[PDB]
Short mmCIF file of C-alpha atoms (C1' of nucleotides) and ligand atoms in Angstrom, two decimals:
data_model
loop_
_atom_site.label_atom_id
_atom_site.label_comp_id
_atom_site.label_asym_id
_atom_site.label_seq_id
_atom_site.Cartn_x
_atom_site.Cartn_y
_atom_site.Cartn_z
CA UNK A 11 -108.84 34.31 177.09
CA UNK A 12 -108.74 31.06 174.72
CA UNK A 13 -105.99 29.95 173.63
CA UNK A 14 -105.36 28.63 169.92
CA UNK A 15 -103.89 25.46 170.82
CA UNK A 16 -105.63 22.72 172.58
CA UNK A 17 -102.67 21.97 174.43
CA UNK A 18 -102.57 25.15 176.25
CA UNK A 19 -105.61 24.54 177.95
CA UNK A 20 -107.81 22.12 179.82
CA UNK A 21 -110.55 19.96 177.96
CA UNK A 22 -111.99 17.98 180.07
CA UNK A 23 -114.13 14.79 179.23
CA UNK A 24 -117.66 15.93 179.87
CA UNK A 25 -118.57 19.87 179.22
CA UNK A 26 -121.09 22.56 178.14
CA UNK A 27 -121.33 22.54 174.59
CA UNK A 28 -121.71 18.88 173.73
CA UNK A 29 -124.24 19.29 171.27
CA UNK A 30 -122.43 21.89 169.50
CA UNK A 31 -119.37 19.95 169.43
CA UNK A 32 -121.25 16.84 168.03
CA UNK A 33 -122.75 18.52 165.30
CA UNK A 34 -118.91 20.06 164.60
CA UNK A 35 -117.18 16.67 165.00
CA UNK A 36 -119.96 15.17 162.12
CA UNK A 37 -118.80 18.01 159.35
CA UNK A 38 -114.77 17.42 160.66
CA UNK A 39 -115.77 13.64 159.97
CA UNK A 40 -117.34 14.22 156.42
CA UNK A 41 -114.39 16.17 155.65
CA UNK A 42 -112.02 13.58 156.52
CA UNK A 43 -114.10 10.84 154.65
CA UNK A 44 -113.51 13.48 151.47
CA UNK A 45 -109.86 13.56 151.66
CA UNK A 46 -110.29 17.23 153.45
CA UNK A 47 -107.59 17.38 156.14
CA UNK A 48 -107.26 20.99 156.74
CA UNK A 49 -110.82 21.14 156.88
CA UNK A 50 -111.53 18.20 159.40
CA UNK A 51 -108.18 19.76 161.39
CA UNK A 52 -110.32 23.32 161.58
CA UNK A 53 -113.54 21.69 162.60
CA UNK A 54 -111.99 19.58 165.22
CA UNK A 55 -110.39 22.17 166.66
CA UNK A 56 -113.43 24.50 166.95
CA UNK A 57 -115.13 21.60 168.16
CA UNK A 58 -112.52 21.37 171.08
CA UNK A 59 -112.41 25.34 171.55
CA UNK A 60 -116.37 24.33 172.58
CA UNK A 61 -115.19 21.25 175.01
CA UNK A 62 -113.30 23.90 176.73
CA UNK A 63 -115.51 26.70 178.00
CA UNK A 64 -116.48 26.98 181.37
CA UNK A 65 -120.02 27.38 180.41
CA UNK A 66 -122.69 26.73 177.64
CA UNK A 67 -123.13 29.08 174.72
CA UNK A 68 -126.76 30.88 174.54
CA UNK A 69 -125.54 33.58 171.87
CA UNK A 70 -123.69 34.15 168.38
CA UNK A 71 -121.91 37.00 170.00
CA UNK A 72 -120.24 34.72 172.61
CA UNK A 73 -117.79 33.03 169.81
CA UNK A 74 -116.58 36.27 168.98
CA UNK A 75 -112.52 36.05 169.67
CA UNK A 76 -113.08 32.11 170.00
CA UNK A 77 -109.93 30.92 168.08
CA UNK A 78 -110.97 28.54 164.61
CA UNK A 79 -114.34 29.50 164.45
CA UNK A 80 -114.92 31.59 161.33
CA UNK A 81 -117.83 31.99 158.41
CA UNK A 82 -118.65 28.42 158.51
CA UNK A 83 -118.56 27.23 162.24
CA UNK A 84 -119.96 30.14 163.28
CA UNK A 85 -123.07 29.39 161.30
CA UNK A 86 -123.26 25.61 162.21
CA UNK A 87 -123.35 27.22 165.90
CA UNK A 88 -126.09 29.58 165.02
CA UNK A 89 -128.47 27.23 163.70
CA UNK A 90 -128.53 25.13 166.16
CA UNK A 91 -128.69 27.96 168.62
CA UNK A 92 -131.67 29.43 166.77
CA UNK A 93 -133.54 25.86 165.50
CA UNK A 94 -132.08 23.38 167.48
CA UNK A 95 -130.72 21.53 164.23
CA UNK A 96 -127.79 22.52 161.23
CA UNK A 97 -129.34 21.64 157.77
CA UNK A 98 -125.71 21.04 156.58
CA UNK A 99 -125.15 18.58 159.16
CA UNK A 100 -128.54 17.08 158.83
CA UNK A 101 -128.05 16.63 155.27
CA UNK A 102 -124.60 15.13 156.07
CA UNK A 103 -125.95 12.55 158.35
CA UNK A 104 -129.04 11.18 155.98
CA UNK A 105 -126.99 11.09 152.86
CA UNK A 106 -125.42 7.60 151.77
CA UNK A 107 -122.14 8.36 151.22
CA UNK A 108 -121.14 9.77 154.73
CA UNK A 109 -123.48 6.51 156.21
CA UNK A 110 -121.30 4.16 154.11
CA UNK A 111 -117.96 6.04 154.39
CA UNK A 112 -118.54 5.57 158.32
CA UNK A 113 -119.92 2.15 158.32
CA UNK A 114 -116.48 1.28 156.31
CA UNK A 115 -113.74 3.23 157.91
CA UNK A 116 -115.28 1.66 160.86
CA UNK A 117 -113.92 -1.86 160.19
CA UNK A 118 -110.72 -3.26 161.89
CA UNK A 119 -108.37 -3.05 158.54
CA UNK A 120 -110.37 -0.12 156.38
CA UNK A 121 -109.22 3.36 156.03
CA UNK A 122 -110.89 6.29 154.13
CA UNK A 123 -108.95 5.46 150.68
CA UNK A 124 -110.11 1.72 150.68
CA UNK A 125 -113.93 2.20 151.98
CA UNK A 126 -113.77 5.35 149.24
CA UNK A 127 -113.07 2.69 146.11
CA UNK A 128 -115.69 0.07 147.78
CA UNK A 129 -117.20 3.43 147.57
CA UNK A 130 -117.24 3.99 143.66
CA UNK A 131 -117.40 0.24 142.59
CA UNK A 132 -121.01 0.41 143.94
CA UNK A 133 -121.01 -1.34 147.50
CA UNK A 134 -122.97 -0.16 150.31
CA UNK A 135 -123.39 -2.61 152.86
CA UNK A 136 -121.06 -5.10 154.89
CA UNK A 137 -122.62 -7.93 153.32
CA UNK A 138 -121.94 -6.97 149.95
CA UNK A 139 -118.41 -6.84 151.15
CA UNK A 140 -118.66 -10.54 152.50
CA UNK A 141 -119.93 -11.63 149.09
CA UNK A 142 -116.54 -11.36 147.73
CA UNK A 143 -113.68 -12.07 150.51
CA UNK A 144 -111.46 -13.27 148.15
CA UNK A 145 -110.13 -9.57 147.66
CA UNK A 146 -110.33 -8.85 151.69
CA UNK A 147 -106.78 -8.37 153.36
CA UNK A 148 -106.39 -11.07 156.23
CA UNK A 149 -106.79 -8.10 158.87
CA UNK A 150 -110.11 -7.11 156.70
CA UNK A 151 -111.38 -10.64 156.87
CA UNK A 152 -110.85 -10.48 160.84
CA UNK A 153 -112.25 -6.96 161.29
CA UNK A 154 -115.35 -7.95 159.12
CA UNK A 155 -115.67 -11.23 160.81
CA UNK A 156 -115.84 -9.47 164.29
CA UNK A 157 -116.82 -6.42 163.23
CA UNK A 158 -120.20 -6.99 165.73
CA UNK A 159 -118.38 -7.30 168.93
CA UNK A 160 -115.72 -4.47 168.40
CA UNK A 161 -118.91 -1.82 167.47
CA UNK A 162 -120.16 -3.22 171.42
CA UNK A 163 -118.50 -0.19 173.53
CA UNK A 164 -115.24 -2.07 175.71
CA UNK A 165 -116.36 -1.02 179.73
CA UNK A 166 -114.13 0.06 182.77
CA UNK A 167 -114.97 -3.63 184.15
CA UNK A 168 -113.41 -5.29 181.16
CA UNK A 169 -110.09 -3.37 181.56
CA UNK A 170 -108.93 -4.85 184.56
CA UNK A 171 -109.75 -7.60 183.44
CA UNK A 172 -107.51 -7.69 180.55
CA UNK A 173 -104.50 -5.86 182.06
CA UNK A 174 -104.29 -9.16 184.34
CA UNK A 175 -103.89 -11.40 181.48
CA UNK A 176 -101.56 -8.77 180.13
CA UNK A 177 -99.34 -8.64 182.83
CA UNK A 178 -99.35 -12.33 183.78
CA UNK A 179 -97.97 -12.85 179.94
CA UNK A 180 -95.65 -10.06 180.47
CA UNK A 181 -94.48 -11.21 183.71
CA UNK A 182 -93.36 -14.81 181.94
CA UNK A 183 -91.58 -12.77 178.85
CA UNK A 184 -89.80 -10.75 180.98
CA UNK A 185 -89.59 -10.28 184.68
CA UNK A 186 -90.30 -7.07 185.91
CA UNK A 187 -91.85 -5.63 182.87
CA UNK A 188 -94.68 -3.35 183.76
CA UNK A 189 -98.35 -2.91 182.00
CA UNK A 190 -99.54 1.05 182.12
CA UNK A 191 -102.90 2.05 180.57
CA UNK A 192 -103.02 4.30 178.20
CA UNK A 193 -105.49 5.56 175.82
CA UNK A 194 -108.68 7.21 176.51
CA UNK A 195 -109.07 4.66 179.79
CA UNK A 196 -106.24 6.91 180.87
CA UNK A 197 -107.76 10.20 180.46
CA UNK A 198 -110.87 8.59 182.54
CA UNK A 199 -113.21 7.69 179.87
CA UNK A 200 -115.92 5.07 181.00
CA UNK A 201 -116.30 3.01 177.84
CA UNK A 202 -114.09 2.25 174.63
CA UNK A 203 -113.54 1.23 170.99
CA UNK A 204 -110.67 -0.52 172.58
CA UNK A 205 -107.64 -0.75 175.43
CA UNK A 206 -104.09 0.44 175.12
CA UNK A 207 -101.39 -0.55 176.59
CA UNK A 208 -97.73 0.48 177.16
CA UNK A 209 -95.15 -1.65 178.04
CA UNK A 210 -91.52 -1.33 179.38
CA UNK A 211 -88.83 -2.32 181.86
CA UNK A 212 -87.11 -0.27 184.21
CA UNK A 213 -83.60 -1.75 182.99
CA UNK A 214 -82.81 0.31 179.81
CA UNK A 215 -82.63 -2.14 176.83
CA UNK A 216 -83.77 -4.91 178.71
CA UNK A 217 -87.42 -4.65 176.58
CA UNK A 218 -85.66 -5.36 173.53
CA UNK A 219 -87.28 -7.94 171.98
CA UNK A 220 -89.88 -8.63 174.44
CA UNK A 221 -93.32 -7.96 172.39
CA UNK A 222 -92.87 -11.17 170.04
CA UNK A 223 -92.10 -13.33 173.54
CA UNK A 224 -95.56 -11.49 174.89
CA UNK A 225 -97.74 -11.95 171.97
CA UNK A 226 -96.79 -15.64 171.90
CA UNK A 227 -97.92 -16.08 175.08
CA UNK A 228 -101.14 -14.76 174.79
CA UNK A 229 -101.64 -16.73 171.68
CA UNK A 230 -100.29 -19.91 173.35
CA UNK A 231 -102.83 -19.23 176.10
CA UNK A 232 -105.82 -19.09 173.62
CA UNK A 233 -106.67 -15.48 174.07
CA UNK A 234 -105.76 -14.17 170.64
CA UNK A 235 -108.37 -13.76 168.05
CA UNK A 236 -106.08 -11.99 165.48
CA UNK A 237 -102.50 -10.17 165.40
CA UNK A 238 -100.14 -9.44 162.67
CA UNK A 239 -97.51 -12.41 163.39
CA UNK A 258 -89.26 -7.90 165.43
CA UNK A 259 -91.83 -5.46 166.26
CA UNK A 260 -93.22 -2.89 168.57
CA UNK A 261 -96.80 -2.24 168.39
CA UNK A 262 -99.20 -4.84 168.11
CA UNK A 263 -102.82 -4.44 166.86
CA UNK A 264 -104.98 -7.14 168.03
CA UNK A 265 -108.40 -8.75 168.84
CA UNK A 266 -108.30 -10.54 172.04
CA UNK A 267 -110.96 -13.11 173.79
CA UNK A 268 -112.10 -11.59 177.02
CA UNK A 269 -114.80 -13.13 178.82
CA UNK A 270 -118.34 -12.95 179.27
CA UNK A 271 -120.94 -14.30 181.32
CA UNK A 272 -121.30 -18.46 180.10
CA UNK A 273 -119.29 -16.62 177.06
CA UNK A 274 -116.75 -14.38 175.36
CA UNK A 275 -116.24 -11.29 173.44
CA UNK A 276 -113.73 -10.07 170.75
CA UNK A 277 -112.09 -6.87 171.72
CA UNK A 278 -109.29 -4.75 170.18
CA UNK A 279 -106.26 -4.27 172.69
CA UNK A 280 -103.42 -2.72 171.45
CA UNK A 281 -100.00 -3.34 173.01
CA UNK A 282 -96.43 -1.08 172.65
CA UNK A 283 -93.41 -1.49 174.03
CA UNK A 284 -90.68 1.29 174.65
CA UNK A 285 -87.45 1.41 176.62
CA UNK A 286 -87.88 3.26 179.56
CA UNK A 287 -85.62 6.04 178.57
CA UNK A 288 -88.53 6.84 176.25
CA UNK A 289 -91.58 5.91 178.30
CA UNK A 290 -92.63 9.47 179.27
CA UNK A 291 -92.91 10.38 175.41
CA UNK A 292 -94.62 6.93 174.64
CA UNK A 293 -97.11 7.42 177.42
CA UNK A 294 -97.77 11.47 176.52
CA UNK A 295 -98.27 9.75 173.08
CA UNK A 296 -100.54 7.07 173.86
CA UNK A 297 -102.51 8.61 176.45
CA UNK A 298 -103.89 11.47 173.61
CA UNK A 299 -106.34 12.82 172.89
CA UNK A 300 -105.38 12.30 169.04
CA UNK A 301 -106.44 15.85 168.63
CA UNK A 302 -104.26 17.15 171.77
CA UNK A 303 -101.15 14.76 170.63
CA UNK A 304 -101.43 16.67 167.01
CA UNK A 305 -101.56 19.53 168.81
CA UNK A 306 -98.87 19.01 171.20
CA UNK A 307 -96.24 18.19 168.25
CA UNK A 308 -97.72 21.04 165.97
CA UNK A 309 -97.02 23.89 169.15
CA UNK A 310 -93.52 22.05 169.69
CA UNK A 311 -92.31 22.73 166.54
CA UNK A 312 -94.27 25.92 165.07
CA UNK A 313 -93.76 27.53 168.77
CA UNK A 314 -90.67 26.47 170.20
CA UNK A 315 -88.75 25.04 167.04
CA UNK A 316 -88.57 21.32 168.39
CA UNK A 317 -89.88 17.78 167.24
CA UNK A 318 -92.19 15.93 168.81
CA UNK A 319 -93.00 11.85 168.32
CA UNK A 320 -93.72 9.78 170.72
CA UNK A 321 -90.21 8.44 171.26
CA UNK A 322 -88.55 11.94 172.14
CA UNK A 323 -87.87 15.68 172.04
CA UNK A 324 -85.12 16.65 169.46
CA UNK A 325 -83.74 20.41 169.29
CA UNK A 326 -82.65 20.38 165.84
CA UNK A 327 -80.08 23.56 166.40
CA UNK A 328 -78.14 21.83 168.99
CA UNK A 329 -78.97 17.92 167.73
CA UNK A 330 -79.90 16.70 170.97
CA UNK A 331 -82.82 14.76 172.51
CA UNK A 332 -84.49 16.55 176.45
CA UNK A 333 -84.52 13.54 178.46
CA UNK A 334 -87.46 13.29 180.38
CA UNK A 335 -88.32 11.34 183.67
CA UNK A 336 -92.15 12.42 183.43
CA UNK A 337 -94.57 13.97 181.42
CA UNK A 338 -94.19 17.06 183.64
CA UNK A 339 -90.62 17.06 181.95
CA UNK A 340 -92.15 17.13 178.66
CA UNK A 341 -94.76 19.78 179.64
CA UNK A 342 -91.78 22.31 181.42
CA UNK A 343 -89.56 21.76 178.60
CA UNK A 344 -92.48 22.76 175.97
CA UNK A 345 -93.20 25.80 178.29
CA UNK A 346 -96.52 24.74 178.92
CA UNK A 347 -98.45 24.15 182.20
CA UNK A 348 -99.27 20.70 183.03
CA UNK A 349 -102.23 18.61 182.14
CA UNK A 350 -103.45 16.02 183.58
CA UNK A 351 -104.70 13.02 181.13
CA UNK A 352 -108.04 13.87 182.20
CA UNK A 353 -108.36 17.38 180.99
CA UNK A 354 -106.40 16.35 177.83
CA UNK A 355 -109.92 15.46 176.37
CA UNK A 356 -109.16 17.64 173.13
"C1'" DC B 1 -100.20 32.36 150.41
"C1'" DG B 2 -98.42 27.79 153.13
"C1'" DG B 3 -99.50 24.96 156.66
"C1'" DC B 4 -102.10 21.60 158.87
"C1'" DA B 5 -98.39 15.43 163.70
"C1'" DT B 6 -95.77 11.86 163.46
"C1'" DA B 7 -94.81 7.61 163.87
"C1'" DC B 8 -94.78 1.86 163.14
"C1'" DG B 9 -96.84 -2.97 160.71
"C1'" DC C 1 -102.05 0.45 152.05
"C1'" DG C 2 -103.20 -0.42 157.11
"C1'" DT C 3 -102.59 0.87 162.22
"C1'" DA C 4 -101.77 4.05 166.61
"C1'" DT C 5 -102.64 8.44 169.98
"C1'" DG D 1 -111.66 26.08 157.34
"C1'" DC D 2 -109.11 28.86 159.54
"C1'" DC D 3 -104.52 31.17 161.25
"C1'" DG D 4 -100.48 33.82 161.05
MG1 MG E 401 -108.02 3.43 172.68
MG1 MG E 402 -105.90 1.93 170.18
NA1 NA E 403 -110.86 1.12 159.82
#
DNA sequence: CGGCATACG
DNA sequence: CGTAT
DNA sequence: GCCG
């Protein structure tokens, strides 16, 4: 009655299990921070399996048939059903290389093979990484430098505010350009890391170009902390006001032509777990490639248009989800 | 055993 | 290498 | 780590 991929079924944002998926999503994380992919791709998905039961689990025998839990889930489950706490994951969370892994992979600019050689040459703490900028990255330097205000969750207030300035910036670059949120705001979350947008124009081709003309708007309009600068995704901290004040907040921006906007907004919208998901049923099921710019049949060599994401859903033979039970 | 999503800056 | 879902 |  569950099936394997998180695609072909609802997750929705709050659930039943949410300590059991916690404890899951820290051992997923650790295995991540170790170079473990297929390991953090198992423990996700068992983790999700959990978001998406209709009711909480009281008993070992209830994961039996569960798809992606095995030997090791199982017992992470069974621990904390029998003690209230997982001695692997406890001993995960106290010891000082998953703290400094996470502390590191947390900043703007840091992935898991740069925070792992901090790692090994001996540094711990976000100071110690100050103490020698001259071999930060210009995007490290920024992500260090605001690294406080983009750990403060981003609220369902601030959005609004932002996609104003957004749009009144977009609205200059190019006249009737639209602004869509995307991102977890889409699939209703309440709070942030940061906002995502998606950008296009309902004149195909017309959006050529247009990001560079938005970004230097913003910037001319003193709202840019730090981009990157032809281009289509921008990664940046913007200004966004605060009572007699201001915080730094990521906001990231895309553009696609509109031809393209149902894939970029499926894309965008995630969860990252359902999007890998999504692409990994599309071609392992149903023998076509999914990105976030189209659906290619490699037999015949042609792209599905799609006016929707209900397109995309019907031409994947999959019922459709709204963003808010796409909470993988 | 192979496979594990797929892009852009 | 980083970034995005 | 788990699936097919
Ligand atoms: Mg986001
Ligand atoms: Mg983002
Ligand atoms: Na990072």
């Amino acid at each position: 009655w569950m099936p394997a991929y998180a695609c072909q079924r609802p997750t929705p944002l709050t659930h039943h299990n949410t300590g059991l998926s916690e404890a899951l999503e820290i051992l997923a994380e650790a295995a991540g921070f170790e170079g473990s992919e297929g390991r953090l791709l198992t423990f996700c998905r068992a983790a999700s399996v959990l978001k998406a039961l209709p009711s909480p689990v009281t008993t070992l025998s209830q994961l039996q048939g569960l798809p992606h839990f095995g030997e090791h889930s199982s017992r992470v489950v069974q621990e904390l059903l029998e003690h209230g706490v997982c001695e692997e994951v406890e001993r995960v969370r106290r010891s000082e290389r998953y703290q400094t892994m996470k502390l590191f992979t947390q900043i703007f600019g840091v992935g898991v093979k740069t925070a792992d050689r901090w790692y090994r040459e001996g540094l711990r703490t976000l100071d110690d990484l100050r103490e020698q900028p001259q071999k930060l990255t210009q995007q490290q330097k920024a992500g260090l430098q605001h690294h406080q205000d983009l750990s403060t969750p981003v609220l369902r207030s601030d959005v609004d505010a932002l996609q104003q300035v957004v749009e009144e910036a977009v609205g200059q670059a190019l006249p009737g350009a639209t602004v869509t949120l995307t991102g977890g705001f889409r699939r209703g979350k309440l709070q942030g890391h940061d906002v995502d947008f998606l950008i296009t124009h309902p004149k195909e081709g017309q959006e050529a170009g247009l990001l560079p003309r938005v970004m230097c708007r913003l910037q001319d309009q003193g709202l840019i902390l730090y981009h990157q600068h032809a281009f289509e995704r921008s990664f940046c901290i913007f200004r966004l006001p605060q009572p007699g004040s201001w915080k730094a907040v990521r906001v990231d921006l895309v553009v696609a032509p509109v031809s393209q906007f149902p894939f970029a907004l499926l894309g965008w919208t995630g969860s990252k777990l359902f999007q890998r998901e999504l692409r990994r049923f599309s071609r392992k099921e149903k023998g076509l490639w999914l990105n976030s710019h189209g659906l290619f049949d490699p037999e015949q060599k042609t792209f599905f248009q799609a006016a929707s994401e209900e397109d995309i859903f019907r031409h994947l033979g999959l019922e459709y989800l709204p963003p808010e039970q796409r909470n993988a």
